[PDB]
Design a binder for this molecule. Sequence first.
Ligand SMILES: NC(=O)c1ccc[n+]([C@@H]2O[C@H](COP(=O)([O-])OP(=O)(O)OC[C@H]3O[C@@H](n4cnc5c(N)ncnc54)[C@H](O)[C@@H]3O)[C@@H](O)[C@H]2O)c1
Ligand SMILES: NC(=O)c1ccc[n+]([C@@H]2O[C@H](COP(=O)([O-])OP(=O)(O)OC[C@H]3O[C@@H](n4cnc5c(N)ncnc54)[C@H](O)[C@@H]3O)[C@@H](O)[C@H]2O)c1
Ligand SMILES: O=C(O)[C@H]1O[C@H](OP(=O)(O)OP(=O)(O)OC[C@H]2O[C@@H](n3ccc(=O)[nH]c3=O)[C@H](O)[C@@H]2O)[C@H](O)[C@@H](O)[C@@H]1F
Ligand SMILES: O=C(O)[C@H]1O[C@H](OP(=O)(O)OP(=O)(O)OC[C@H]2O[C@@H](n3ccc(=O)[nH]c3=O)[C@H](O)[C@@H]2O)[C@H](O)[C@@H](O)[C@@H]1F
Lengths: 314, 314
Amino acid sequence: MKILVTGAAGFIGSHLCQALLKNSAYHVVGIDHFIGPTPATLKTGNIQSLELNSRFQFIREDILNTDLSKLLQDIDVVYHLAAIPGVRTSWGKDFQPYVTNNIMVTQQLLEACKHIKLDKFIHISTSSVYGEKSGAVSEDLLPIPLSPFGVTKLSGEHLCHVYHKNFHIPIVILRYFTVYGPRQRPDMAFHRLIKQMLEDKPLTIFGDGTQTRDFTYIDDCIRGTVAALETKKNIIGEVINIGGKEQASILDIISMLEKISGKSATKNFLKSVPGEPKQTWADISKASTLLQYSPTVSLSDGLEAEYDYIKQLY
Amino acid sequence: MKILVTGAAGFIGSHLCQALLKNSAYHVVGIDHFIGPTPATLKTGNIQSLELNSRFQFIREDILNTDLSKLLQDIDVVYHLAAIPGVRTSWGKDFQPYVTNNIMVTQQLLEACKHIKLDKFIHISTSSVYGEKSGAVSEDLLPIPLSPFGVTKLSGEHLCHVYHKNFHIPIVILRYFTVYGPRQRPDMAFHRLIKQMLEDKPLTIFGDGTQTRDFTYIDDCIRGTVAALETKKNIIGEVINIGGKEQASILDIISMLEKISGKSATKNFLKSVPGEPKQTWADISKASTLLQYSPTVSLSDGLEAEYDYIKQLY
Ligand SMILES: NC(=O)c1ccc[n+]([C@@H]2O[C@H](COP(=O)([O-])OP(=O)(O)OC[C@H]3O[C@@H](n4cnc5c(N)ncnc54)[C@H](O)[C@@H]3O)[C@@H](O)[C@H]2O)c1
Ligand SMILES: NC(=O)c1ccc[n+]([C@@H]2O[C@H](COP(=O)([O-])OP(=O)(O)OC[C@H]3O[C@@H](n4cnc5c(N)ncnc54)[C@H](O)[C@@H]3O)[C@@H](O)[C@H]2O)c1
Ligand SMILES: O=C(O)[C@H]1O[C@H](OP(=O)(O)OP(=O)(O)OC[C@H]2O[C@@H](n3ccc(=O)[nH]c3=O)[C@H](O)[C@@H]2O)[C@H](O)[C@@H](O)[C@@H]1F
Ligand SMILES: O=C(O)[C@H]1O[C@H](OP(=O)(O)OP(=O)(O)OC[C@H]2O[C@@H](n3ccc(=O)[nH]c3=O)[C@H](O)[C@@H]2O)[C@H](O)[C@@H](O)[C@@H]1F
């Protein structure tokens, strides 16, 4: 059967495509415009990996400049990953690209899916929609984003609900929690901290380093994402958290990188960035039930894999 | 103080400016680009009186193409009513203006308000953020909009929370429920049904006419809205429902119009419009507690006032 992956040249999109292409039953179309925080050179590598496989078709186009009706005629499943993802660069003059690529892009894709016979429209969202909450967050918690970025992603979720209720588009929303591993975007914490450690530079810590994340290793994220397609259960209309094996503070991660590198870190403490929560912590009860999701990669093993990728990247 | 009213030439904004100008201590700056569903001719009629007043400055400019430094200089209070408000016309190509005028406008005003010291930023939102709910809805309910329009308004609310939590912008959110009376927009039900009855044309009913709304008379709406500025108590960060004296069905309303006109309605029943709930019903206990809000205008009195306005208009 035939799967559209939007944002296929990106971090998570390229891994998702690779996993789907392991199944000879699946044909994959990737669409990507090469925009956002990751320079075009690293995305070119991603698409090169995918184009090794005869069952992959690459479309280098803006979704807002694509004949979506024609693109979707033979598509059975949409994975929608295309977005501008940076929590920290969504203020003032930088906000318009988030609205265009996170809101207008999602609305246009849904409009085009109204008269398609889809199995599933699997929309990728973010723990960023919740904002600041205590305890492990469940998917029925009133979300209040802290950043303009989070507002745009939550607007994308709400459009999914509008088109599902009015036009029976078979939507599934996955909320990922801080994904890491090989090919992680260069703007994210682990990529930056690892690169700084490799180059004997001070490690840049925003705030006091006590902020915590439910870090999700890429292979765990992708197992849950493929399960959203393959699950025996009816998940149409569900929001599902996809979170990681182990929660950690940035200080905890720095100690873990010291253990892997065998270097001691010089720390550069900078002012906290507006719009970032102090804690993320997913309740993955629902994923366990509906997807058989269980994250299995420990932070030590995951960080070592990313450490090896960074060391080879540069 | 000096009070900025965005959307000052519209249905609710024109009434709000007139009510503020009754107090000799208020100066009002109104901005309006004369867009959305109401033709410019009716808007000119909305503000003719206001412009004459020496404590009212009117600016006919797009908020996204204006010097917001000039606009916000020494402003103590912002009433943000500017919006594209049509529930039923926010699909397909018509979606872009809702994004521009409901999301980008709100973000640019909040960005401009960062380094000025407001008493209050009173953001007007809509019962359409709730979607399809049963019983009288309270402000703590998880909102799931049914329409692209309702998504864009809920995104504007979320931007208010982001700028409040990060930059201490003193936001207050008012959620109005189906406002009617003199100067009601020509796309709304009462304006359309009264114009049709006046012209001896068939009355257009979407679905079977058993849908109900919490109809809020304009004078009740404005009393609640002015109460949000005039209260000294800390309502900063609060979402407050503003609803009407009496809920009714469209068939109930048409009966009341028949008794006002002494004419019988010819009825055309059309398909239900995607994106509209079957019922709205406000819990106004929070407005009662925070604003001493109590709606006092009955539908028979309110409809006779609108009927009189519509007859005179045409
Ligand atoms: N990386 C994480 O930690 C994380 C966590 C939560 C959720 N997510 C979500 O996962 C998805 C993928 O994130 P990522 O880290 O791989 O980001 P990324 O920037 O690596 O990949 C997204 C891709 O989308 C593409 N794109 C954007 N707008 C487009 C448009 N208009 N037309 C075509 N292509 C377009 C970009 O070119 C980019 O390659 C996003 O929706 C993101 O919000 C990521
Ligand atoms: N009428 C109702 O029943 C109702 C109920 C719930 C909430 N609301 C909200 O109340 C507010 C006022 O609604 P209304 O019925 O008076 O609508 P309206 O269309 O009469 O007034 C809104 C005004 O905003 C102006 N405007 C829009 N975009 C602008 C921009 N970029 N720059 C400058 N001016 C701009 C328009 O020209 C218009 O006159 C809106 O926010 C609406 O969503 C209305
Ligand atoms: O799940 C989510 O909500 C989001 O996951 C990622 O964002 P995060 O900001 O949580 O991840 P990342 O950039 O690794 O930052 C993690 C923490 O690390 C801190 N940090 C980041 C970079 C750095 O150099 N130093 C640093 O201390 C940040 O302030 C933050 O507290 C993704 O970047 C984002 O796309 C996604 F939406
Ligand atoms: O309370 C709110 O949040 C919303 O109130 C209004 O929207 P509504 O659609 O409830 O009001 P209006 O347009 O008067 O419609 C009332 C009912 O009347 C029905 N209707 C409308 C027009 C018509 O010609 N015939 C008709 O049956 C509609 O289907 C709806 O069920 C405002 O138009 C909208 O701006 C606001 F968001």
